[PDB]
Nucleic acid binder design. Sequence first.
DNA 1: ATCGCGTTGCGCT
DNA 2: TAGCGCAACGCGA
Length: 137
Amino acid sequence: TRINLTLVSELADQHLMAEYRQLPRVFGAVRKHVANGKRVRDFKISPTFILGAGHVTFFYDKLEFLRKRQIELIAECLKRGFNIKDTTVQDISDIPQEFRGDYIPHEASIAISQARLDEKIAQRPTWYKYYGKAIYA
DNA sequence: ATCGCGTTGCGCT
DNA sequence: TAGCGCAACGCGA
């Protein structure tokens, strides 16, 4: 799974879709632990953004950032006209507030997010499209 | 109607 | 501890 701090407006159509269906994977992971009775401090949450091991856990006390991000993601998808079935931002009022914090990415964390996108496109530049067209490559 | 491709970490056994 | 498969799907060829 992967969450980017990248502005959704410049996301490659593919990276935009992958994020649409991937982001919601965190709300569910948290709900499940909450079901298991786990608390936010029973998790090794990173002090700073990271990609890889510790990545999604990082977002375990930033459910707002994502919730809000979900609204942004949904918008862009519609703009480009992708027939998405879930046009509704999910209701996370059922989760202990300790998990629902906002998060203000630092300029350095974002650049890191970009780097990944920018090296994942390069693996297949002709294949990545923006609003239907292969602007990369 | 079908097939490849997009992420990759983390929860559970 | 180690390994395994899960977890918001829809588009272009």
